[PDB]
Design a protein around this ligand. Structure first.
Ligand SMILES: [Mg+2]
Lengths: 682, 332
């Protein structure tokens, strides 16, 4: 289970205050005759720092656009896209990328991620059904009481958020609209003429976040890459800043919106947004002061220290692994793990982590120190919890047996089932670190429990043989079945829907309407573990294989991989030389490798986009309602740009967690006062 | 005959036109002091950690460099094996032009070269034959600091193609300055066409496919840090500029060290940035990049015109032993 956004942001606001910063947007000039002067976007950035490459986690834009604050939900795909276009426009105006805009829509994710998504969506669906019952019973009572409920405003037509998933018709709309949007930008403001646009849509496998990071790694590795590229990533995942550190590009910041019975049901009666920067370079400064250990028998390496810090944070729980029972970020687990790491490091032989690999002997050192403390941790927690005015009883002797029997259904008679649980968790830890640093090591691997073993049980780790079966990303329709609850059936091809709803479906057991949520530390149901069955992948694959031959050719095409696209202006410096080499008589079918002066700092392989017909007239794929939006999102009669299928380069080598040569470090921000505070706190 | 050329007697003139140094050939040298016609010894820039002790390995892991000067026939032989025609006025080592060019800056640094016009091609070939004054300090601790800095700042392959052990174990490598990569260049200075050969410390990124590679090349220097108000520092930077300018080297990276040989700071410069950077700190009567070029062009034309008044295969000696004059002697 993930730590969450409020949790990491509170840790950042508490210990790393200077990393968070308000985004400055240049104002519109408003003249007394209603003339409005939009700021010139080619001018310097009011934030002082210029951006080269802007990367967008597009689904982190679609979601907020689906439930706005003072502008209730859009209902139509067309309405949705106008909102998305406007939100994106705002980001482009505040960020002002000079070299690249990378738009990443989530493609099929690895099984480990799919399981987190399955749990979340099952819980959201359960939450929404429980709300719907309560709301309708409230409305019935209000009718009989003579209270005039505004039923149109109360019964809100909510955007089906489950359509924001690879393989749905809306994903085709999103892709087509964003293709247009790119072509628009390339044929409008002159400031986007020198900007290259990449679209990585939902038919390209991988989380949007990770496709961005994998792109960064693929470019870093090229000798002619600019070692002082300024990166800005927009995304909402709590993960994002961890990925930013993992990148080892110091010129890096995250863009995000500033996080800092009648009410909950949305009852309405007839008679009744700033953004923030998260500066990863400033985070690196903090961690240098935080993680430096004197008199080591091996060289101190900030890059190695940062990686360790990214790794031991996995213990507090993320998308792919449950938190260890004794570790909670709210209870200062990150600070506790940092102190254990600092104390262990001099005698440990080296760093926990090596370019995405885990030293299991060293992991055991960290975990043993946690395991020695947990008896007391569970006692302290209960002691503090009683200062406010279950069956496991962690604060009470014998809890090991009760926890494993109640949560894992392991009797004290079966000690090898605990060992199998820790083996699985260890695999998980290695899976996540390789995922962050080298790429997904297994598209099928998952942690097959809802709870973690105690840290005390992480003994003899070095003897565990960690291996992964890479396999392949699941087909879009397989991910949908691996992720959706039965109530979201509408998002699948009609012939595949029956697998979730029909009593006689081979795999009906994967889709129960009713399931238990275990509180495991009483709070509320959102602070809980959903006890869902884990899908048997073979059974799911065999079930779809019988129905696949009955899908239309279009449904089948929607189940296959598509391409990443590169859009460049005809006025771009690279254009004329790229076209000469591309339409050259060496071969017009073989991909063109971007190299020499021609590449202009972008690397990979390009080929022609065959789907595009050489008619320069391009129209908007969706309808627009307002007169101002029809003006800014209209037809493009002369498309002065080309689109190309684009493939990132792939290194034959392990990517190293090191700074590039030529790296010129951003100005130091932490004052005597800042460094003082960090010293005393640790 | 004996002829003298005064650095002072040169009138104010426009800076001579200087062409972009074009690489026509390259080669590698090994530790056994043999030559190979390939990119074998080409290296890539990757920095060491700061506070690196540049003494490490002196002298136990130190392969002292050759002390006798290389005959210029070496370069003539390379070019002819490759079937490259020599249609220029001078063939020499880049370092020998630097010495002529920078002589006015260094009255203490004495030197002598031998000059012969080839009867077949008409090219004037220049070399040293006697062990140079500078080479006598070849294996001093402070010279080692420079060789050490080069060893811990370069890689055999691009960064990504190197293991992290390869990078992190560089402090434990033998320091072998005889192992080098070299570039042979055509460069025009005024009416003089020169073919020059010199060591290339490493490359910034990689050698372009065939684009001229020299702007991708890097020179590595070690020095004590002083402000630009310090004349000694300006003079050193001017001499750094002159050397790299002559082979069209794009970047100079200086490892600034303290008195005990510890690397405290590194500074990246574009070669062509140096003149502008020094400009504000120049006072009247100072040697500037342009004045050094004017006086060099005049020196080269004076040598050419003198040598051409005599039969081919006449040996000449060019000496600087301090003062404001170069001395050119015909050997009988
Ligand atoms: Mg050097």
């Amino acid at each position: 289970a993930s730590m969450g956004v409020p949790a990491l942001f509170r840790l950042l606001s508490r210990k790393f205050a200077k990393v968070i910063t308000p985004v400055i947007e240049a104002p519109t000039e408003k003249l007394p005759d209603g003339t409005e002067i939009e700021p010139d976007l080619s001018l310097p950035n009011p934030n002082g720092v210029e951006c080269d490459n802007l990367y967008l986690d597009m689904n982190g834009i679609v979601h907020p656009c689906s439930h706005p604050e003072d502008r209730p939900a859009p209902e139509t795909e067309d309405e949705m896209m106008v909102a998305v276009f406007e939100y994106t426009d705002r980001i482009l105006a505040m960020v002002r990328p000079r070299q690249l805009l990378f738009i990443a829509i989530d493609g099929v994710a690895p099984r480990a991620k799919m399981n987190q998504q399955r749990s979340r969506r099952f819980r959201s669906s359960r939450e929404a059904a429980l709300k719907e019952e309560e709301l309708q019973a409230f409305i019935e009572e209000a009718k009989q009481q003579g209270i005039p409920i505004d039923e149109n405003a109360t019964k809100k037509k909510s955007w089906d958020s489950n359509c924001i998933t690879p393989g749905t018709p809306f994903m085709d709309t999103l892709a087509k609209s964003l293709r247009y949007y790119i072509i628009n930008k390339l044929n409008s403001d002159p400031c986007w003429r020198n900007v290259r646009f990449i679209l990585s849509d939902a038919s390209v496998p991988g989380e949007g976040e990770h496709k961005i990071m994998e792109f960064i790694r693929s470019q870093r590795v090229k000798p002619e890459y600019d070692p002082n590229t300024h990166h800005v990533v927009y995304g909402l995942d709590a993960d994002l800043i961890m990925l930013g550190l993992a990148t080892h590009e110091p010129h890096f910041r995250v863009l995000r919106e500033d996080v800092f019975k009648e009410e909950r049901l949305g009852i309405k009666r007839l008679d009744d947004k700033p953004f923030i920067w998260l500066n990863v370079s400033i985070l690196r400064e903090y961690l240098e002061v935080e993680l430096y250990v004197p008199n080591l028998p091996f060289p101190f390496d900030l890059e190695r220290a940062i990686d360790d810090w990214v790794f031991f944070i996995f213990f507090v729980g993320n998308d792919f692994l449950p938190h260890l029972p004794s570790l909670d970020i709210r209870d200062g687990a990150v600070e506790r793990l940092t102190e254990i790491w600092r104390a262990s490091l001099p005698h440990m032989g080296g760093y926990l982590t090596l370019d995405g690999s885990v030293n299991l002997a060293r992991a055991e050192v960290i975990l043993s120190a946690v395991g020695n403390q947990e008896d007391d941790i569970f006692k302290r927690l209960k002691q503090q919890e009683d200062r406010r005015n279950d069956t496991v009883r962690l604060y009470e002797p014998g809890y090991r047996e009760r926890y494993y029997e109640q949560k894992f259904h392991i009797s004290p008679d079966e000690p090898e089932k605990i060992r199998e649980a820790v083996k699985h968790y260890v695999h998980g830890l290695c899976w996540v670190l390789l995922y962050y640093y080298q790429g997904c090591p297994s598209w099928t691997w998952y942690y097959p429990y809802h709870y973690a073993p105690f840290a005390a049980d992480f003994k003899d780790l070095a003897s565990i043989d960690v291996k992964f079966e890479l396999n392949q990303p699941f087909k879009p329709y397989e991910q949908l079945l691996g992720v959706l609850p039965a109530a979201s059936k509408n998002n699948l091809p009609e012939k595949l829907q029956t697998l979730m709803t029909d009593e006689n479906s081979e795999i009906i057991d994967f889709y129960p309407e009713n399931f238990t949520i275990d509180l495991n530390g009483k709070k509320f149901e959102w602070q809980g573990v959903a006890l869902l069955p884990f899908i048997d992948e073979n059974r799911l694959l065999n079930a779809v294989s019988k129905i696949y031959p009955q899908l239309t050719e279009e449904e089948s095409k929607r189940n296959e991989d598509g391409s990443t696209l590169l859009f460049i202006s005809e006025h771009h410096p690279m254009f004329s030389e790229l076209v000469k080499q591309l339409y050259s008589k060496k071969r017009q079918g073989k991909p063109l490798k971007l190299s020499g002066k021609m590449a202009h700092g972008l690397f990979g392989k390009v080929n022609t986009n065959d789907s595009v017909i050489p008619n320069v007239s391009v129209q908007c794929p969706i309808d627009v309602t307002s007169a101002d939006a029809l003006q800014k999102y209209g037809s493009i009669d002369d498309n002065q740009s080309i689109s190309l299928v684009f493939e990132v380069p792939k290194s034959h080598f392990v990517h190293k967690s090191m700074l590039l040569r030529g790296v010129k470090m951003p100005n130091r921000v932490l004052t005597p006062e800042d460094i003082n505070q960090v010293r005393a706190e640790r | 005959m004996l002829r003298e050329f005064s650095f002072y007697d040169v009138p104010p003139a426009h800076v001579p036109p200087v062409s972009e140094p074009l690489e026509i050939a390259c080669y590698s040298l090994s530790r056994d002091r043999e030559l190979l016609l390939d990119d074998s010894k080409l290296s890539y820039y990757y920095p060491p950690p700061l506070f690196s002790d540049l003494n490490t390995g002196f002298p136990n892991r130190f392969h002292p460099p050759k002390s006798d000067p290389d005959p210029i026939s070496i370069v003539k032989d390379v070019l002819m094996t490759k079937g490259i025609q020599m249609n220029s006025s001078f063939l020499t080592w880049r370092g020998l032009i630097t010495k002529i060019m920078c002589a006015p800056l260094d009255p203490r640094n004495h030197w002598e070269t031998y000059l012969v016009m080839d009867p077949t091609s008409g090219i004037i070939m220049m070399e040293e034959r006697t062990r140079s004054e500078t080479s006598y300090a070849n294996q001093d601790r402070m010279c080692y600091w420079g060789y050490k800095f080069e060893a811990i700042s370069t890689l055999p392959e691009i960064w990504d193609a190197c293991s992290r052990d390869q990078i992190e174990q560089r402090d434990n490598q033998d320091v072998v300055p005889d192992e080098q990569y070299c570039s042979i260049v055509k460069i025009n200075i005024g009416k003089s066409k020169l073919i020059l050969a010199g060591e290339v410390d490493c490359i910034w990124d990689k050698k372009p496919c065939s684009e001229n590679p020299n702007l991708h090349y890097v020179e590595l220097k070690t020095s004590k840090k002083y402000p630009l108000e310090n004349y000694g520092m300006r003079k050193k930077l001017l001499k750094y500029w002159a050397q790299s300018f002559l082979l069209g080297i794009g970047r100079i990276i200086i490892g600034f060290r303290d008195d005990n040989g510890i690397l405290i700071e590194m500074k990246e410069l574009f070669t062509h940035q140096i003149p502008k950077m020094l400009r504000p700190y120049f006072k009247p009567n100072d040697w500037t990049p342009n004045r050094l070029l004017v006086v060099l062009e005049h020196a080269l034309e004076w040598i050419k015109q003198t040598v051409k008044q005599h039969p081919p295969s006449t040996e000449f000696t060019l000496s600087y032993t301090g003062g404001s004059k170069l001395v050119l002697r015909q050997i009988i």
